[PDB]
Write a protein that binds this ligand. Structure first.
Ligand code: VAC
Lengths: 99, 99
């Protein structure tokens, strides 16, 4: 699709058989989702945003379907205000910015 | 132009005759630049992101040039770690997300 930015670019994602809403965020290096249960072991990671840093759990090789496009990569879980689809997955779905 | 997301999508902006570098951020509702002086009256505002909230100064009707394209809108100034071009101005230059 072609998404305009008059509103937040929210899309439905499916992870662990659940549907959630997430933001296509070109300003985000990584993907972070609100607290949830993900399979496997996690490694520690710190991410810095506008307000400062937070500690998140890092899971590798997670399948996530974004607007019906399957992607598999690293997903972080922590105290994020919204579910964020960052550049690591955007690139897997061939998303680009156009003007 | 068509911008890929292998790297952060950084562009050159021209504000108050000052030439700068900024991030095209679709995850950002507003535009926020690092501490600088704009002409006019400003209003205090609080914007929240990952890590919490920051206090910025809000200036209305500022002209910005993004990759040659002139755009007008509100510009926030504060302790942001990077200059960010949010949705309020990406819309003015006709930016869209495509996959
Ligand atoms: O884009 C980004 C993020 C976002 C998220 C969100 C959304 C919605 C709500 C909340 C949150 C943000 O923060 N946003 C915000 C809002 O919208 C309000 C405002 C904003 C912004 C601006 C203005 C206003 C952002 C970004 C920034 C930066 C960049 C670079 C560096 C630093 C900072 C962020 O944060 N990012 C980050 C990085 O890249 C790393 C990471 C990882 C993950 C995620 C994110 C991130």
């Amino acid at each position: 699709p072609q998404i305009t930015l008059w509103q937040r670019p929210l899309v439905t994602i499916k992870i662990g058989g659940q549907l959630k809403e997430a933001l296509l965020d070109t300003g985000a290096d990584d993907t972070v989702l609100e607290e949830m249960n993900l399979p496997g072991r996690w490694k520690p990671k710190m991410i810095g945003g506008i307000g400062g840093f937070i500690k998140v759990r890092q899971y590798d090789q997670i399948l996530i379907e974004i607007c019906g496009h399957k992607a598999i990569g690293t997903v972080l879980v922590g105290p994020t205000p919204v579910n964020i689809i960052g550049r690591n997955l955007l690139t897997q779905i061939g998303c680009t910015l156009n003007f």
